[PDB]
Amino acid sequence: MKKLQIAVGIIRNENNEIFITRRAADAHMANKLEFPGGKIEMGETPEQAVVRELQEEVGITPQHFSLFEKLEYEFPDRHITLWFWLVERWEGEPWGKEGQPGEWMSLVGLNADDFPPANEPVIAKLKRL
Numbered sequence: 001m002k003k004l005q006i007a008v009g010i011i012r013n014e015n016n017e018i019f020i021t022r023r024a025a026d027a028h029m030a031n032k033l034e035f036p037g038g039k040i041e042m043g044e045t046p047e048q049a050v051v052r053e054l055q056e057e058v059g060i061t062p063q064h065f066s067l068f069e070k071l072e073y074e075f076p077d078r079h080i081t082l083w084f085w086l087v088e089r090w091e092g093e094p095w096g097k098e099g100q101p102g103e104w105m106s107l108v109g110l111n112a113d114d115f116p117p118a119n120e121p122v123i124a125k126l127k128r129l
């Protein structure tokens with residue numbers, strides 16, 4: 001199975017809400033809620049990838065962010081390594097820049113069952129902040 005490195009951004013506003021998008025029906029992890037992000041490309045770093053991915057997907061440039069968690073997860077047909085960056089400062093206003101559903105969701109209300117199973121420990125850890 002293929003192996004992927006994925007960088008994602010946990011976009012947290014001052015009201016303890018996270019900007020969450022919903023994956024397309026024909027995507028891997030179809031219809032799941034997700035932190036915006038995507039594949040780290042050859043020649044770019046995990047830090048550069050989360051910036052580029054958030055610019056492409058939601059129209060913001062994250063800045064002064066931190067690595068919240070890094071973990072590996074084995075899906076039925078692929079192995080991924082996820083870099084979860086906590087993004088508390090950014091330029092712009094996040095939106096569905098690729099036409100995808102996005103909205104702000106209270107951290108306390110997040111349901112890990114709505115996200116890919118790889119996100120379980122991250123969602124739990126976020127709720128302890």
Ligand SMILES: Nc1nc2c([nH]c(=O)n2[C@H]2C[C@H](O)[C@@H](COP(=O)(O)OP(=O)(O)OP(=O)(O)O)O2)c(=O)[nH]1
Nearest residue numbers: 006008028029034035036037038039080116118119
């Ligand atoms: N974006 C994102 N992906 C996640 C999360 N949790 C999780 O297991 N994944 C998995 C689902 C996918 O297998 C992979 C993310 O790839 P992606 O489909 O977002 O990649 P991408 O935007 O670069 O896709 P592409 O169209 O550029 O090829 O990581 C998450 O919170 N956010």
Ligand SMILES: OC[C@H]1O[C@@](CO)(O[C@H]2O[C@H](CO)[C@@H](O)[C@H](O)[C@H]2O)[C@@H](O)[C@@H]1O
Nearest residue numbers: 046047048062063064065066067068085
């Ligand atoms: O790896 C993130 C980690 O590095 C620090 C500096 O110790 O921040 C640097 O890296 C971030 C990610 O590229 C930048 O956004 C930031 O501006 C830079 O100082 C820590 O703040 C952070 O935990």
Ligand SMILES: [Mn+2]
Nearest residue numbers: 036037038057
């Ligand atoms: Mn993506």
Ligand code: NA
Nearest residue numbers: 037038039053
């Ligand atoms: Na991508």
